[PDB]
């Protein structure tokens, strides 16, 4: 045991020396010359009200119009953002829901939480009635995040420290992703959907190979638990939001941290993180009730969204990048533009 | 023409959401900690009690879910010193950023202390209340010391000694929590 701990510490030093060798110039030195974005001022265009209790998660459709949201009253509402009309309202078996996902096809919606089960809901059907199609019961801890690859495959991160790739048809785990020591809180799929990154309560982010089923790279830099993780549209970087009141940008090819997005004024943690379509802006949701817009390249703060009176839980950007949706504990969704 | 059909569907959902709004506010949610949901009625009052038996001993993330619950039912038994472990858990929940408005109904079940608590050596039984009572009320006051330290009148602790009538105790304590919440709002308390 004492030998392998010495061998483990020896390799960690070799990885740190390899990471310091490839580091010559910081992202700030390259981005010092290029002009600032200016003041990004954005207003609540829509206020979606219907949820009784606090909203824990939301997700956009691939049509960039329909979005689904989950609240702890045990309801799962699919909204029409353009017209503010409700399309579906789904009563859940377990009222304690923490994650919801919208299928890229737009045919299914997934959600789960403290029940330790991921429930797939068919939105189409011949009847035109919303019913739970399959219930995935493998995780021994609460479901934190779930994201579809296609109609038949879905990845889930739970509080039992494991991520799991599911086959929805047969309803059994195809691959288990073991590595994290703490609760895995968020997932993010690459554009190619051949890799995903997961942020856990061990202050570590891990890059996974979906096809093979093993961890490729482990990213460290955050002090406390990583609550939110989001892939940079390029697919060669990702941003992580932690309880240490910092967001950080990591490069997959450089295998190290690039930038930190922190201000002395901010002492609360980051719940949610999402990029703009170009990636130039980084939006982060805080538990001081407001969202901060960051210049991803320059690290300076661009603007603020100050609509919610309670904790901002989730934060989504449309595929066409026209809007940004914030869910909150005040039980309101707000569309910013 | 298509926008007219979307309004009709939106009307059905809002009519159903109005019926659910009354059932949600009428029901009193409870958290029990020392995966199952239980719904019961006492005097035609709906209670929805969640048990956290199927989760890991790392609580700091999933505990945040119960920031709007009516009351937490904290059960404690009276080798490793399990009583101090329970005091530390109570202290965390009480001083938590999101649980600092939530009252706690305490249940002390199963009925040396001087070795594990040196403050007991000089402790005397309260007049409001035998080496059994001295112990019983020492452990009670140990939990009440934490609840009176940071409360600020927003939430209170309701101790009880367990060994059938336990369901009625939670009913009466929930009444007091709601009463005290409103009385403080109207500035009468």
């Amino acid at each position, epitope marked *: 045991l004492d030998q392998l701990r010495q061998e483990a510490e020896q390799l960690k030093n070799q990885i740190r020396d390899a990471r310091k060798a490839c580091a010559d110039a910081t992202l700030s030195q390259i981005t010092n010359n290029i002009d600032p974005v200016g003041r990004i001022q954005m207003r609540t265009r829509r206020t979606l009200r219907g949820h009784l209790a606090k909203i824990y998660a939301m997700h956009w459709g691939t049509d960039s119009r329909l979005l689904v949201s989950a609240s702890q009253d045990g309801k799962l509402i699919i909204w029409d953002s353009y017209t503010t009309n409700k399309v579906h309202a789904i009563p859940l078996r377990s009222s304690w829901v923490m994650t919801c996902a919208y299928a890229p096809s737009g045919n299914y919606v997934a959600c789960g939480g403290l029940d330790n089960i991921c429930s797939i809901y068919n939105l189409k059907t011949r009847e035109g009635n919303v019913r739970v199609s399959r219930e995935l019961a493998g995780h021994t801890g609460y479901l934190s995040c779930c994201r579809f690859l296609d109609d038949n495959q879905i990845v889930t991160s739970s509080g039992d420290t494991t991520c799991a790739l599911w086959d929805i048809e047969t309803g059994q785990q195809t691959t288990t992703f073991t590595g994290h020591t703490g609760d895995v809180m968020s997932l993010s799929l690459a554009p190619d959907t051949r890799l995903f990154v997961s942020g856990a*309560c061990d202050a570590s982010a891990k890059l996974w190979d979906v096809r093979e089923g093993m961890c490729r790279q482990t990213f460290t830099g955050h002090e*406390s638990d990583i609550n939110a993780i989001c892939f940079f549209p390029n697919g060669n970087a990702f941003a992580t939001g932690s309880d240490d009141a910092t967001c950080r940008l990591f490069d997959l090819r450089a295998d190290q941290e690039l930038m930190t997005y922190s201000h002395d004024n901010i002492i609360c943690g980051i719940t949610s993180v999402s990029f703009s379509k170009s990636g130039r802006l980084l939006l982060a949701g805080y538990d001081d009730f407001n969202c901060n817009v960051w210049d991803a390249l320059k690290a300076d703060r661009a603007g603020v969204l100050a609509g919610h009176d309670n904790r901002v839980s989730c934060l989504g950007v449309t595929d066409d990048g026209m809007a940004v949706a914030t869910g909150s504990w005040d039980s309101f969704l707000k569309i910013w533009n | 023409n298509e926008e007219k059909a979307q309004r009709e569907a939106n009307k059905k959902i809002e009519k159903q959401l109005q019926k659910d709004k009354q059932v949600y506010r009428a029901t009193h949610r409870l958290l029990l900690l020392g995966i199952f949901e239980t719904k019961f009625q006492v005097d035609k009052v709906n209670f929805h009690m969640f048990d956290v038996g199927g989760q890991r001993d*790392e609580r700091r993330k999933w*505990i945040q879910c119960f920031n709007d619950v009516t009351a937490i039912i904290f059960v404690v038994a009276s080798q490793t*010193n399990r009583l101090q472990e329970a005091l530390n858990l109570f202290k965390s929940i009480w001083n938590n950023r999101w649980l600092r408005t939530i009252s706690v109904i305490l249940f002390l079940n199963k009925q040396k202390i001087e070795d*594990y608590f040196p403050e007991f050596a000089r402790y005397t039984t309260p007049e409001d209340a035998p080496r059994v009572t001295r112990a019983k009320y020492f452990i009670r006051d140990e939990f009440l010391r934490i609840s009176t330290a940071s409360g600020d009148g927003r939430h209170y602790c309701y101790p009880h000694f367990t060994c059938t009538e336990n369901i009625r105790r939670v009913f009466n304590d929930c009444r007091d929590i709601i009463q005290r919440m409103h009385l403080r709002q109207y500035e009468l308390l």
Partner: nanobody, 128 residues
Framework: QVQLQESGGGLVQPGGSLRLSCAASGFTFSNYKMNWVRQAPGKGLEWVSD????????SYTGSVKGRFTISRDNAKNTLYLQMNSLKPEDTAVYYC?????????????????????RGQGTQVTVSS
């Protein structure tokens, strides 16, 4: 990367003294509340003492009260535990654990078996 290293353990005679040090790196030491926790042979992890960010609010378990003193330096990111008049029921692996989030009053999961922000631990043996 968050890294805590315990040193200052060993075999001491009953009624003797030891001084446990805890070297911290990868976080702002001054922003976090610090704890000591021990795991005796054939027992569970039990909390010993904690010390606030500044070093004002201090608490112990009854067993160690008057015999143990927790002190922290902020210039040097180290946590100390001065152990006086030790008895054989103190024999345990002492771990150096910090609360999960900075600035927060509450301190969760510090004895949670799988806790991430906890050191490797140092062995203390009280025998004749």
């Amino acid at each position: 990367q968050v890294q805590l290293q315990e040193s200052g353990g060993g075999l001491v005679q009953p009624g003797g003294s030891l001084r446990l040090s805890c070297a911290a790196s990868g976080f702002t030491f001054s922003n976090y509340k610090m704890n000591w926790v021990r795991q005796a042979p054939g027992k569970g992890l039990e909390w010993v003492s904690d010390i606030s960010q500044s070093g004002a609010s201090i608490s112990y378990t009854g067993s160690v009260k008057g015999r143990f003193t927790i002190s922290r330096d902020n210039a040097k990111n180290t946590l100390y535990l001065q152990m006086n008049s030790l008895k054989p029921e103190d024999t345990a692996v002492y771990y150096c654990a910090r609360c999960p989030a900075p600035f927060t009053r509450d301190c969760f999961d510090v004895t949670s078996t799988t806790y991430a922000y906890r050191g490797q631990g140092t062995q203390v043996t009280v025998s004749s």
